[PDB]
Amino acid sequence: SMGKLSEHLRYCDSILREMLSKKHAAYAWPFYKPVDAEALELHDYHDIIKHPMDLSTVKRKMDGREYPDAQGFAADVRLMFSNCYKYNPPDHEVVAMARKLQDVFEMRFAKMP
Ligand SMILES: COc1cc(C(=O)NC2CCN(C)CC2)ccc1Nc1ncc2c(n1)N(C1CCCC1)CC(F)(F)C(=O)N2C
Secondary structure (H helix, E strand, C coil): CCCHHHHHHHHHHHHHHHHHCHHHHHHHHHHCCCCCCCCCCCCCHHHHCCCCCCHHHHHHHHHCCCCCCHHHHHHHHHHHHHHHHHHCCCCCHHHHHHHHHHHHHHHHHHCCC
């Protein structure tokens, strides 16, 4: 009943639910939680990536309605992908996995009424 802004935010909630769901778990799982640079022994990760982002953080912020509009939500989802492209070798499996998940994201986002 509140119009397009409310509807866009609800649609974004749904995109996020889909990205976190079992449907995409073959490629989305590296993006469920913040990169644990200590556990992964990535001693240069936080020197290269200045603004880490991941789907659990997007969920915390979206559920708290910290994104004022759909573009703000998209910016953080795309930051997550961009961090992966920036840090990792371009032929790495994890870059292909980020790309598979971004194909889903961009498709759903483009079809937001
Ligand atoms: C428990 O989680 C993992 C476990 C294993 C795992 O189980 N690895 C090995 C354990 C020991 N040997 C035997 C081989 C598998 C590998 C990766 C994991 N998780 C992860 N999450 C996120 C990123 C990532 N990884 N990336 C990968 C690239 C290659 C090494 C980290 C680089 C990155 F920079 F952090 C990045 O951008 N992303 C998005």
